[PDB]
């Protein structure tokens, strides 16, 4: 419950309908119900899961940044006191965003990561684990900040180690993992040199392996490769 009474296949079908309707909160609830059925997810199902939560948390993060910016302006010299409401509402959005991250991290810990044995599933879920700890780190300001950052780092690092051993350098999940771990280094871990090195090396190793790919795979790999290029252009 509340998805316990719905067939697994019906939850998957409805997640795809919610995706078409851009109803990402519904999509995430349906996929959470699907995961809670206890069976491993297919590649298509894992992508539905990740898209749903990525969109939900993406909207919450964008809102949090708008509110945090307002809050920061309210704390500058010569700004008029407007009371507690900006902080209260930023905290409200923050707590909801934390709850979504804890929900995703809970699904990963119960029991997606432990049953994931193939590299494509294990790396995918460990990348999600890094991403949702990273989103927690974006809003962390207290005594658990370093531990949250560590947790993101640890998840991404295990995903990187598996992906380098078991996946081609052009694999979209390997490329996406590297893209996000590089963003983690640049924006969360105060390590822009490591972010740039990772994005460079990733892009270059992928370029050298493109020759092995069919026309469809080439298009898939080159798309994430352009995101790496976009960040290199921004950061250098």
């Amino acid at each position: 419950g509340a998805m316990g009474s719905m067939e697994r296949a019906s939850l998957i079908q409805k997640a795809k309908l919610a995706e078409q309707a851009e109803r990402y909160e519904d999509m995430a609830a349906f996929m959470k119900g699907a995961v809670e059925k206890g069976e491993e997810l297919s590649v298509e199902e894992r992508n539905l899961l990740s898209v749903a939560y990525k969109n939900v948390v993406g909207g919450q993060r964008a809102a949090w940044r708008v509110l945090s910016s307002i809050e920061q302006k309210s704390n500058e010299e010569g700004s008029e006191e407007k009371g507690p409401e900006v902080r209260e509402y930023r905290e409200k959005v923050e707590t909801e965003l934390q709850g979504v991250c804890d929900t995703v991290l809970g699904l990963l810990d119960s029991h997606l990561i432990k049953e994931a044995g193939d590299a494509e599933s294990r790396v995918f879920y460990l990348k999600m684990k890094g991403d949702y700890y990273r989103y927690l780190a974006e809003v962390a300001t207290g005594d658990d900040k370093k531990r949250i950052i560590d947790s993101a780092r640890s998840a991404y690092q295990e995903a990187m180690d598996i992906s380098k051993k078991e996946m081609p350098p052009t694999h979209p999940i390997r490329l996406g993992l590297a893209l996000n771990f590089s963003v983690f280094h640049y924006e969360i871990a105060n390590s822009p040199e490591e972010a740039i090195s990772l994005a460079k090396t990733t892009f270059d190793e992928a370029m050298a392996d493109l020759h092995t790919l069919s026309e469809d795979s080439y298009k898939d790999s080159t798309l994430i490769m352009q995101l790496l290029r976009d960040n290199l252009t921004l950061w250098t």
């Binding site: 991403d131 996406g176 893209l179 996000n180 963003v183 640049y186 924006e187 994430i224 995101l227 790496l228 976009d230 960040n231 921004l234 950061w235």
Partner: peptide
């Protein structure tokens, strides 16, 4: 303007 993630 915003760095990319995926």
């Amino acid at each position: 303007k915003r760095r990319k993630s995926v």
